[PDB]
């Protein structure tokens, strides 16, 4: 029973990492867009 529970937990943990990585990537791109907007605005 512990083996089944840990296997389910590991699968849920791996799914959460994929979801978090998907969300982190969106936050990574939005950070770049913000910087490329302030610097371009600051240039002009």
């Amino acid at each position: 029973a512990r083996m089944v529970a840990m296997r389910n937990a590991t699968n849920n943990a791996k799914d959460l990492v994929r979801d978090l990585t998907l969300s982190f990537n969106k936050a990574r791109q939005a950070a770049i867009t913000k910087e490329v907007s302030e610097i371009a605005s600051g240039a002009a």
């Binding site: 990574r28 770049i32 490329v36 610097i39």
Partner: protein, 495 residues
């Protein structure tokens, strides 16, 4: 005469007004005036209309509006040749060690085109780093551009200095550029090189942090011009015309920062991370000049060792990604491993060398394959280390084998192991000969074994070094000689 007058001085940037017939990267003069007995040179980067924005190589605090400038017809050139060996110089070739003028007869221009496609040859001759981890799992060959990427204080310049020290008689002219390093750090590096006798085949360019951004911007190019002179014409080292060279750009992160500062002060349009559009072009011009010339063009070499200081292991940053794409191999030095205790902090799981075994001696390639496989197997089971008691016999055995190998890869500072010692020790480890030795005693065992071979058994070391190039290295009697040496050492010593 066609000269110009400064019309505006910013944060190290002039404008020079109407200075025609100026080449796009000349080195203007700023002739001496009242209250200034010397000349400060500047690089005319922006050739605008009715304006020439030139960054100042020297100090900007002295150049006032109205100063006259004379455009010297020469593009930036540096001295090269034998006379530079063992001397610290500016990126302009002016000595700063205070030991006399540079003796030279030839000046190789900075910013020359890469050798070309057909000019090069496949990398085959190895650059013996002297570090077991690098020299076994991440081969570096003459002509390869291997990147030493890390995170703040991790050991990148320590690895570079170990590599430079290991070339004592490997017929390799080392070069150390030190872009943006502190004057104290460059002084300590030069002191270390002098202390170990490595200051008779090393040229140390240096554009320290206090120096103007122009000097930090042109430092690596001066270094690689000095290295290209070695690669093409060569210098007399130990009575042998050596045409190999090894160049270490101590920070290309700081070089990129300096170029970003130059671009922003010149009002060039920024890009991602405020870096100019052509920072990739900058680093590519710099690194691509490192080549393995074929026999038709001389057979020289120039091995480049760029170093990058990442932040929080952010590999996806702009400059790290650019240089990783440019370079042929990466040596990641992780701060986690450095703080854990593994002093050479190589992260084998992600560090790669695209040249591969072609940049390794046949003995080294024959021995290191099992080491790499066993280390990979240990890494795949790193989560079970604390659960060693409740594991299968084979899984356990894999675990202590990985622990022994990882402890073996640990190395002190300024202790480069010649190739014969590395191959002997890794043959001892790959064969089930260090299993009885406890994990914390592996380093002591290795040091004692090298001492034993150096004193008791010079013949086996000479035998291994003599036939390191044999395609079937283990076949020769060298195998039995080495086995007898290991058995005798393990009998005499106890752990």
């Amino acid at each position: 005469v066609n000269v110009g007058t400064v019309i505006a001085v910013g944060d190290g940037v002039a404008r020079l007004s109407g200075l025609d017939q100026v080449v796009a990267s000349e080195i203007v003069e700023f002739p001496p005036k009242a209250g200034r007995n010397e000349s400060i040179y500047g690089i005319a980067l922006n050739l605008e209309q009715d304006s020439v924005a030139a960054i100042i190589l020297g100090d900007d605090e002295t150049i006032e509006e109205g100063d006259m400038v004379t455009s010297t017809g020469r593009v930036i050139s540096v001295p090269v040749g034998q006379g530079l060996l063992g001397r610290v110089v500016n990126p302009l070739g002016q000595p700063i060690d205070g030991k006399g003028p540079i003796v030279y007869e030839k000046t190789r221009p900075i910013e020359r085109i890469a050798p070309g496609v057909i000019t090069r040859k496949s990398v085959d001759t190895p650059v013996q780093t002297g570090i077991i981890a690098i020299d076994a799992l991440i081969p570096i060959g003459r002509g390869q551009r291997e990147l030493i990427i890390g995170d703040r204080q991790t050991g990148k310049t320590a690895v570079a200095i170990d590599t430079i020290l290991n070339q004592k008689g490997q017929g390799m002219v080392c070069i150390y550029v030190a872009i943006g390093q502190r004057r104290a750090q460059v002084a300590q590096v030069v002191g270390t090189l002098e202390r170990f006798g490595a200051m008779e085949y090393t040229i140390v360019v240096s554009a320290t942090a206090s120096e103007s951004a122009a000097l930090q911007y042109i430092a690596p190019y001066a270094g690689c011009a000095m290295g290209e002179e070695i690669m093409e014409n060569g210098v007399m080292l130990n009575g042998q015309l050596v045409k190999d060279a090894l160049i270490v750009y101590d920070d290309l992160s700081k070089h990129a920062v300096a170029y970003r500062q130059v671009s922003l002060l010149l009002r060039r349009p920024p890009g991602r991370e405020a870096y100019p559009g052509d920072v990739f072009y900058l680093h590519s011009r710099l690194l691509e000049r490192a080549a393995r010339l074929n026999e038709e063009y001389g057979g020289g070499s120039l091995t480049a060792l760029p170093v990058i200081e990442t932040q929080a292991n952010d590999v996806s940053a702009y400059i790290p990604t650019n240089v990783i794409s440019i370079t042929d191999g990466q040596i990641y030095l992780e701060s986690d491993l450095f703080n854990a205790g593994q002093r050479p902090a190589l992260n084998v799981g992600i560090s790669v060398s695209r040249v591969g075994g072609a940049a390794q001696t046949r003995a080294m390639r024959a021995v290191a394959g099992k080491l790499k496989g066993e280390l990979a197997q240990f890494r795949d089971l790193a989560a079970f280390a604390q659960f060693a008691s409740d594991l299968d016999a084979t899984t356990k055995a894999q675990i202590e084998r990985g622990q022994r190998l990882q402890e073996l890869l640990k190395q002190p500072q300024y202790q480069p192991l010649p190739v014969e010692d590395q191959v002997a020790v890794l043959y001892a480890a790959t064969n089930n000969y260090l299993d009885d030795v406890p994990v914390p005693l592996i380093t002591k065992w290795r040091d004692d074994f090298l001492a034993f071979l150096r004193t008791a058994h010079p013949e086996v070391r000479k035998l291994i070094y003599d036939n390191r190039l044999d395609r079937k290295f283990p076949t020769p009697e060298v195998k039995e000689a080495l086995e007898a040496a290991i058995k005798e050492f393990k009998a005499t010593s106890n752990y």
